[PDB]
Amino acid sequence: KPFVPKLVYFEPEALSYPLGKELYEKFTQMGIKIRETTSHNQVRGIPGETELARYRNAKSTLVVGVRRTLKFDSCKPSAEYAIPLATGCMGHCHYCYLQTTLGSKPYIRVYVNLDDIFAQAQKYINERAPEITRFEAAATSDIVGIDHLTHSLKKAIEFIGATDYGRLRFVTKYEHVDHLLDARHNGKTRFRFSINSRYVINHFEPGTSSFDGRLAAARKVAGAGYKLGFVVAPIYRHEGWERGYFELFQELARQLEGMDLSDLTFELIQHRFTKPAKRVIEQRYPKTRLDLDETKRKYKWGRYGIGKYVYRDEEAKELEDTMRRYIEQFFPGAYVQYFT
């Protein structure tokens, strides 16, 4: 049930680092097919005759490379920066925004040069101290879902835990958190889970852990002293969404009752999609119920890239107000960090 790749690519340079060496040893011992690639951003020969086949097979492919981009991207409103530990995901969420993100790849990538990466993170922290600098580790991947293979996130958690002015956060749809429970987080990591209505999870989130699985994991990480949070996203106006999301927060409260929820956080993100979304999603998920009708949406223009469709202002406000009402009803004193 925890993710294991069926095909693994290595950059030759990756073997020079401890994680690369360790993964090569692990995967050869398991007898898994291993290939070489010059760059992790140009992987050749992933099997499949159709686009759909190559896409599905890429989602079962792990690529082990070196992070050569010095700059960390900003990650507002979640955090100051995205810390780059991995890219890609084994999940098959129909709506996933990563599908149409510039330069995104369908395969799962992990970076081995953690010394370089954490040193750069410390540099950003130093540049802003004594202000707090937050790092998002799950901006372009499900870092938690991959981590049982690498422990890169566990190392990041403990790196940030040792800093004075650094904070870490990440969000997951996976329950495989056991190895992270004894990590020395030192109160400086916010462990979040993506949750949604029964409609959205059942119809649009195949290849992820169940709602009960995500909540079991949430109880574990809270019990281990992590700061707990939830990301309600994508907020999607399906038939009967009002009651659907009411029952989400009601069930969420029942599954967390007894626990201290004085520092619990919520983040709210409405469903958004880009212009190329329809063609990409229809090819990859032919039977999807996902509504990508742009005529009923408002378009936000891009800045340096292309923009995105979101719900019209009045629909978005309706969503925000309704979610805020439910959170106030079932989780008094929980902080809503933002709606976007």
Ligand X SMILES: C[Se@@+](CC[C@H](N)C(=O)O)C[C@H]1O[C@@H](n2cnc3c(N)ncnc32)[C@H](O)[C@@H]1O
Point out which residues bind ligand X (CB under 6 A).
89, 95-98, 138, 142, 171-173, 194, 231, 233-234, 269, 271-273
Q: Residue 271 CB, nearest distance to ligand X (Å)? A: 5
CB-CB contact of 338 with 316 (8 Å)? no
272's contact among ligand X, ligand SF4, none, with CB below 5 to 8 A by partner kind, is ligand X
From the list 217, 215, 308, 211, the residue with the least C-alpha distance to 269 is: 308
End-to-end CA distance of the chain: 33
Q: Residue 74 CB, nearest distance to ligand X (Å)? A: 15
Q: Residue 241 CB, nearest distance to ligand SF4 (Å)? A: 19
Determine whether the annotation assigns residue 75 to a binding site. Answer: no
Q: Residue 136 CB, nearest distance to ligand SF4 (Å)? A: 13
Cα-based distances in Å from 272 to 95, 98, 246, 269, 284: 8, 11, 21, 8, 18
Instruction: Find tokens 């907020």 and name the residue.
Output: 235
Q: Which is nearer to ligand SF4, 93 or 235 (CB)?
A: 93
CA–CA gap between residue 216 and residue 202 (Å, rounded): 18
CB-CB contact of 286 with 298 (8 Å)? no
Indicate which single residue of 173, 185, 284, 297 sits in contact with ligand SF4 (rule: CB under 6 A).
173
Is the CA virtual torsion 95, 97, 102, 104 positive or negative?
negative
Q: Which is nearer to ligand SF4, 20 or 91 (CB)?
A: 91
Indicate which single residue of 5, 84, 91, 106 sits in contact with ligand SF4 (rule: CB under 6 A).
91
* Ranges of H-type helices in 133-269: 143-147, 152-162, 198-204, 211-223, 241-255
Binding map of ligand SF4 across residues 202-241, x = CB under 6 A, - = no contact: ------x---------------------------------
Those residues with Cβ within 8 angstroms of residue 189's Cβ, 6 or more apart along the chain or in another chain: 157, 160, 161, 167, 168, 169, 170, 226, 227
| Binders of ligand SF4 in range 98-127 (CB under 6 A) | 98
Peptide bond into 276 cis (omega under 30): no
Q: Residue 58 CB, nearest distance to ligand X (Å)? A: 16
Contact stretch for ligand SF4 (CB under 6 A) within 3-11, 88-96, 260-268, 298-306 = 88-96
Determine whether the annotation assigns residue 93 to a binding site. Answer: yes
Q: Residue 25 CB, nearest distance to ligand X (Å)? A: 27
Determine whether the annotation assigns residue 96 to a binding site. Answer: yes
222's contact among ligand SF4, ligand X, none, with CB below 5 to 8 A by partner kind, is none
By three-state DSSP, how is residue 81 classified?
Answer: strand
Positions at the binding site: 89, 93, 96
List interacting residues with ligand SF4 (CB under 6 A): 89, 91, 93, 96, 98, 142, 173, 208
Positions at the binding site for [4Fe-4S] cluster: 89, 93, 96
